[PDB]
């Protein structure tokens, strides 16, 4: 079977969202809905997912911008991995 | 209005596209039929003897 999360989309812009909007960007599998992407994240990382935006990239992959609840901290999460 | 150069400029209509069945850019999206493999017309694949010399 296919995994929902491929890996962390790490780029300057992704950093901003992380350091500024408490947002973590991911490269996910294209058949994954927002809700699926939501769950998967709250699990592999143990947090509260507030909202998730998706975009099908010109790379053949789907990018997801995930915003964590005010409790959890994006920077603090991404730091460990 | 010449049929040449000046009439080439109106050609911005899409017809033949990548074929879901044979992978060729011969799927006529307006006809929904591949001119190469016959997808959309027949279950059997398009093929004729005249595609090669008679004794070959």
């Amino acid at each position: 079977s296919w995994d929902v999360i491929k890996h962390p989309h790490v780029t300057e812009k992704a950093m901003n969202d992380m350091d500024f909007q408490n947002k973590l960007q991911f490269a996910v599998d294209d058949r994954a809905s927002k809700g699926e992407v939501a769950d998967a994240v709250e699990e592999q990382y143990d947090v509260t997912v507030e909202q998730v935006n998706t975009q099908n990239t010109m790379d053949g992959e789907k990018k997801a911008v995930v915003r964590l609840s005010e409790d959890d901290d994006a920077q603090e999460v991404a730091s460990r991995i | 209005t010449g049929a040449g150069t000046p009439s080439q400029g109106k050609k911005n209509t899409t017809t033949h596209t990548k074929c879901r069945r044979c992978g060729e850019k011969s799927y006529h999206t307006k006809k929904k039929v591949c001119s190469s493999c016959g997808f959309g017309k027949s279950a059997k694949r398009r093929d004729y003897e005249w595609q090669s010399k008679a004794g070959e």
């Binding site: 294209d30 099908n56 010109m58 790379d59 053949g60 | 990548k18 850019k25």
Partner: protein, 49 residues
């Protein structure tokens, strides 16, 4: 023109196939491999579909 998720994928692959032959391959192959016999310019060339 409005594209579909499938079309968008194919284009994406095409853009990717359109990259140099990694610098190292040159050495690994004693330079017998240098040219990407599949370079496709956006203006000069035409992608299928």
């Amino acid at each position: 023109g409005k594209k579909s998720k499938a079309t968008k994928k194919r284009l994406a692959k095409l853009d990717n196939q359109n990259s140099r032959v990694p610098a190292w391959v040159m050495l690994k192959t004693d330079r017998e491999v240098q040219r990407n016999h599949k370079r496709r310019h956006w203006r000069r060339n035409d992608t299928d579909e």
